[PDB]
RNA sequence: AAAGGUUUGGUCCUGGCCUUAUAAUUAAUUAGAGGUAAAAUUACACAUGCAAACCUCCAUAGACCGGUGUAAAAUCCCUUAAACAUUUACUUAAAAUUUAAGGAGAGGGUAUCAAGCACAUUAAAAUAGCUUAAGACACCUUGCCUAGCCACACCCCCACGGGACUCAGCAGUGAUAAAUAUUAAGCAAUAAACGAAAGUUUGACUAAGUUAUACCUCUUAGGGUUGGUAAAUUUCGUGCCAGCCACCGCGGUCAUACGAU
RNA sequence: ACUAUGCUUAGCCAUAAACCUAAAUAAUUAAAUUUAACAAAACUAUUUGCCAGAGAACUACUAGCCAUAGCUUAAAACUCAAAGGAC
RNA sequence: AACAUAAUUAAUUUCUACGUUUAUGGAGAUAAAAGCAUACUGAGUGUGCUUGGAAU
């Protein structure tokens, strides 16, 4: 049995379910939440369930969490311009908190698809090379082309050993 | 950490001095206390020599000017 | 251990595999120094033919000579290999039959 | 007005020391994923920051701004803001003094003092 | 063989003191001082002082 | 791992070792040829030959290719700035390639290495600070990041200087090691250098030679094993002897375990 | 028979099967749960400490210590295919 | 240690010479009522403690 409570939180599939990818402006997200209370329950679940997913998609963002420092839970984002975005998450479900932060400071689906396509621009199916980078190492693999001499011996007339002998004979 | 204003009055009235917890624990034994004492003494002497050299160097420059 | 304890310690420490009689080498060449008999641990009762050899590394070791009858003598050259002699305690080397002075058992 | 090279253009941390002149030692923490466990833990870093007015106290949360030119070997940041003062927190949501999970001044009232 | 153990103990502690003294000489010599700090005498910490 | 064998009088638990799979090297025995890939004991010492030229003088090149893993926890990824021993265009802007200063994070061992001893800040030059059990410092070992990258180039970390005075370029030699490719052909192809160019040069490379080290296509048959794990022993000899075992074990005269068959 | 000693007042020693052989906390009694067996019904969550076959070894060495045969900390070579626990 | 010459096309020289590591008694093969800690002697006994002895 995997240790801890809700061990599914420690699986790559769960971490990859996060949908909040912050804009490049976002630099820090401080989380102020209370460990005891009734109006801060959604905030506690957000730290428990969602903060791992947010960090997984935003490795360069500093997430620092503070406990029992204020009467109410809130989120404060620090942007690169110097702006500070305060969010109030009291009486808000963890799902509501995730959707709110996605709207205000989350990249849209269109933007992300463009980056994924751009990332693969230099991979070409026609390119030949190692399996790590390319589909086919050599043109011998293609159908109709001359096969590799190791797999199929070349005709005698196409071999340097044979051609050299004829030149001596001439 | 919660009410600093109350904290200040309480210590002043009750006459209690509060020292903050030290970040790092320091081990203590005869060999350490003796080596740590020399290192402080060696440093101080080196800095005293530097100060004397600076005064002599500046004094010579002042005379030339 | 707790997840915090597993994190602070990381993967379990694995001591490196100890080298054996050949010092992590397929075979070694040694010069015979003496030929003697060793008595197997009881319940085994025999007169096993062994020899002391000075290996190329420079150390001196005892090597069991397999086969029924050997012609080895002092100053001969042999190629020793790994493999412990179970009944003979301390004999972790064996002689290779058919190499250098040592020859194949003489089927008679 | 080119910005710093350092990645940490903005760092939040706690003032763990203030014994240097006009400098505050700040401990920041980030979350790092353990590859074996797939769990996040706290990796903490120490940042020296220029406290021009010596207005920092141990235990208070602060925001640091990366300096354009390193002031010294270790001082590459300045004190942008004191997010939370030690024991003197002011609730961002309501704006009223608080002492833990309680209001020193009720939000219903309007003292304006 | 306790007698030897006491003999080994008293000779081991003497080497332990010389190593302590030498380590202190290395520090000030490296710092650039040519003599130990004024009024300093390496304490004898392994002898029968208690 | 889909597991198996092995503590005992017996059962169960715990717990190690071993077996069955895969590969590399060396060795014993054995083997026809052909196609292909690879080639590897040692940063020990080296006879001999070759590996850098080009070209109307100036220059350019010999700073590359090639080789080895010496050193160093040395690195990875990322940021910023500037260049080049450069190119191409403009007489100024796109690149390739480097250098330096850095840091989100990641990065071998020993804690019987527990303290390091100036490792800090301020900028009137004062303050007493800085790193460290969230592993400093010390020591030890190690090429890693693999379309490739880093480090080294007889030694002295460097190379003014000194000295054990040069093949870690190709091919060879001695010594050493369980470890064994030709002192070979051609610049025809591609790459590099040089030239305005026809062209020239290249132990890079190309085409061969050598070798069951690997795969493919054929064709001869050899090697081992045969108590259990674990597929398979029939007659004799030996008799705790000679021998055999990866583990458990076998042999003291009806040996499925050793030797021949 | 008699002594160190057990007692007292001042200092030191830091060891016990110092064990209820049960770490400390908040749960639950249902999961159609003797989930080995014997102890003390079982099980969950949290935090720290500790363990990684056996002998070598409550050992060697290092370091700390009013201790000087001590105390705490604690290996390697080596050798084996067991050692060990409850019935 | 580091000046100066030149100058009716422009150049010249200077731009020095300590300490620290490695190495040459003990534990293991072939068989040719109890205990823990501790003190004394020799396992005997003393003091405390445990049941992993026993006692209707
Ligand atoms: S791999 Fe393509 S010709 Fe051999
Ligand atoms: K087993
Ligand atoms: K062979
Ligand atoms: K070098
Ligand atoms: K050519
Ligand atoms: K056969
Ligand atoms: Mg061979
Ligand atoms: Mg190269
Ligand atoms: Mg090396
Ligand atoms: Mg050489
Ligand atoms: Mg050199
Ligand atoms: Mg060569
Ligand atoms: Mg050369
Ligand atoms: Mg070979
Ligand atoms: Mg040629
Ligand atoms: Mg040209
Ligand atoms: Mg028979
Ligand atoms: Mg047989
Ligand atoms: Mg008396
Ligand atoms: Mg030791
Ligand atoms: Mg008790």
DSSP codes, A75-128? EEEEETTS-EEEEE-TT--HHHHHHHHHHHHB--HHHHHHHHHHHTTT--TT-B
Which helix (H) or strand (E) segment is B10 a member of? helix B4-14
CB contact under 8 A, A70 and D93: yes
Q: Token pair for residue A82?
A: 């110097």
DSSP structural state of residue D98: B
The backbone torsions φ and ψ at residue D49, rounded to the nearest 5 degrees and listed phi first, read -130, 145
Which helix (H) or strand (E) segment is E22 a member of? helix E2-31
Q: Are C51 and C62 in contact (CB under 8 A)?
A: yes
Task: Identify the experimental approach.
Answer: cryo-EM
Residue B46: name the closest of E24, E36, D73 by CA: E36
Render the burial of B20-47: b for 16+ CB within 10 Å, e for the rest. eeeeeeeeeeeeeebbeebeebbeebee
Residue A73: burial class (beta carbons within 10 Å; 0-12, 13-18, 19+): buried
CB contact under 8 A, D100 and B5: no
How many Cβ pairs closer than 8 A exist between chain A and D? 74
From A130, A135, A140, A154, mutation site for ligand 1 pocket: most ligand atoms within 8 A of C-beta: A140
Give the separation between CA A102 and CA A160, rounded to whole angstroms.
66
Give the separation between CA A71 and CA A90, rounded to whole angstroms.
10
- Cα atoms found within 13 Å of the Cα of residue B64, Cβ hemisphere only: 6
Q: Is B36 helix (H, G, I), strand (E, B) or coil?
A: helix
A39 lines ligand 1 (CB under 6 A): no
CB contact under 8 A, C3 and D36: no
Q: Is D33 helix (H, G, I), strand (E, B) or coil?
A: strand
Give the separation between CA D85 and CA B1, rounded to whole angstroms.
9
Question: C-alpha distances in angstroms, D85 versus B5, C46, D16, D53, D97?
Answer: 12, 88, 13, 15, 11
Give the separation between CA E18 and CA D111, rounded to whole angstroms.
73
Q: Is A51 helix (H, G, I), strand (E, B) or coil?
A: helix
Sign, Cα dihedral of D79, D80, D83, D84: positive
Using the Cβ of C19 and the Cβ atoms of chain A, whether some distance falls under 8 Å is answered with no
Render the burial of A78-112: b for 16+ CB within 10 Å, e for the rest. bbeeeeeeebebbebebeebbebbbeebbbeeeee
Residues of B in contact with D85 (CB under 8 A): 4
Nucleotide nearest to C41 (CA to C1'): H30
Using the Cβ of B32 and the Cβ atoms of chain E, whether some distance falls under 8 Å is answered with no
CA E5 from chain center: how many Å? Answer: 20
- Declared resolution, Å: 3.2
Q: Are C106 and C69 in contact (CB under 8 A)?
A: yes
Q: Token pair for residue D34?
A: 């353990």
Contacts of C78 (CB under 8 A, 6+ apart): C29, C30, C31, C32, C51, C53, C63, C72, C95, C96, C99, C100, C101, C102
Number of other residues whose CB lies within 10 A of the CB of residue B57: 10
Using the Cβ of B19 and the Cβ atoms of chain D, whether some distance falls under 8 Å is answered with no
* Order of strands across the sheet that contains A74-79: A62-67, A26-33, A74-79, A84-88
- Cα atoms found within 13 Å of the Cα of residue E49, Cβ hemisphere only: 7
Q: Are A72 and A39 in contact (CB under 8 A)?
A: yes
Give the separation between CA D26 and CA A72, rounded to whole angstroms.
26
DSSP structural state of residue A59: T
∠ CA(A105), CA(A108), CA(A111), 5° rounding?
Answer: 120
Q: Are D74 and D16 in contact (CB under 8 A)?
A: no
Number of other residues whose CB lies within 10 A of the CB of residue D29: 18
Q: Is C52 helix (H, G, I), strand (E, B) or coil?
A: strand
- Cα atoms found within 13 Å of the Cα of residue D51, Cβ hemisphere only: 21
Smallest Cα distance from D108 to chain A, Å = 14
CA A45 from chain center: how many Å? Answer: 24
Q: Is B9 helix (H, G, I), strand (E, B) or coil?
A: helix
Give the separation between CA D58 and CA D66, rounded to whole angstroms.
21
A138 lines ligand 1 (CB under 6 A): yes
Strand partners, A54: none
Q: How many residues does chain C have?
A: 108
Q: Are strands A84-88 and C77-81 parallel, antiparallel or unpaired?
A: unpaired
Using the Cβ of E17 and the Cβ atoms of chain B, whether some distance falls under 8 Å is answered with no
């Amino acid at each position: 049995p995997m240790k801890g409570r809700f061990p599914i939180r420690r699986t790559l599939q769960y971490l990859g379910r996060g949908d909040v990818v912050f804009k490049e402006s976002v630099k820090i997200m401080t989380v102020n939440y209370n460990t005891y209370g009734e109006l801060g329950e959604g905030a506690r679940k957000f730290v428990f369930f969602n903060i791992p997913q947010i960090q997984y998609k935003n490795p360069w963002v500093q997430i620092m969490m503070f406990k029992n420092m204020t009467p109410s839970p809130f989120l404060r984002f620090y942007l690169d311009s110097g702006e500070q975005v305060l969010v109030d998450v009291e009486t808000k479900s963890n799902k509501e908190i995730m959707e709110h932060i996605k709207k205000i400071l989350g990249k849209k689906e269109e933007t992300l698809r463009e980056e994924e396509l751009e990332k693969q621009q230099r991979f070409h199916p026609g390119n030949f090379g190692p399996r790590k980078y390319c589909l086919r190492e050599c043109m011998c693999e293609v159908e109709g082309q001359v096969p590799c001499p190791g797999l199929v011996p070349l005709p005698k007339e196409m071999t340097g050993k044979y051609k050299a002998a004829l030149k001596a004979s001439t | 950490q919660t009410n600093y204003d109350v904290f200040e009055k309480t210590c002043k009235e009750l006459g209690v001095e509060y020292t903050l917890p030290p970040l790092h624990f320091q081990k203590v034994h005869r060999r350490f206390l003796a080596k740590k004492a020399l290192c402080i003494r060696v440093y101080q002497e080196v800095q005293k020599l530097k100060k004397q050299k600076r005064a002599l160097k500046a004094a010579a420059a002042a005379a030339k000017k | 251990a707790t997840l915090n304890q597993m994190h602070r310690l990381g993967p379990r420490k694995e001591p490196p595999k100890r080298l054996g009689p050949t010092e992590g080498r397929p075979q070694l060449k040694g010069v015979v120094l003496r030929t003697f008999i060793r008595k197997p641990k009881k319940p085994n009762s025999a007169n096993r033919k062994c020899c002391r050899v000075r290996l190329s590394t420079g150390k001196e070791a005892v090597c069991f000579i397999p086969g029924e009858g050997h012609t080895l003598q002092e100053h001969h050259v042999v190629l020793v290999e790994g493999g412990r002699t179970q009944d003979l305690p301390g004999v972790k080397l064996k002689v290779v039959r058919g190499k250098y002075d040592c020859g194949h058992v003489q089927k008679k | 007005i080119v910005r710093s090279s350092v990645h940490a253009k903005w760092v939040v941390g706690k003032v763990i020391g203030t014994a240097m002149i006009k400098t505050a030692k700040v401990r920041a923490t980030r979350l790092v994923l353990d590859p074996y466990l797939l769990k996040y833990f706290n990796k903490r870093k120490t940042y020296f920051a220029h406290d021009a007015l010596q207005q920092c106290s141990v235990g208070d949360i602060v925001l640091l701004r990366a300096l354009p030119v390193p002031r010294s070997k270790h001082v590459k940041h300045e004190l942008a803001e004191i997010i939370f003062k030690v024991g003197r927190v002011i609730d961002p949501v309501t704006g009223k003094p608080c002492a833990g999970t309680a209001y020193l001044e009720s939000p219903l009232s309007e003292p304006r003092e | 063989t306790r007698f030897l153990r006491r003999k080994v103990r008293e000779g081991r502690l003497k080497k332990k003191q010389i190593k302590f003294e030498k380590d202190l000489k290395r520090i000030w010599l490296k710092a650039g001082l040519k003599e130990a700090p004024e009024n300093w005498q390496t304490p004898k910490i392994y002898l029968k002082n208690k």
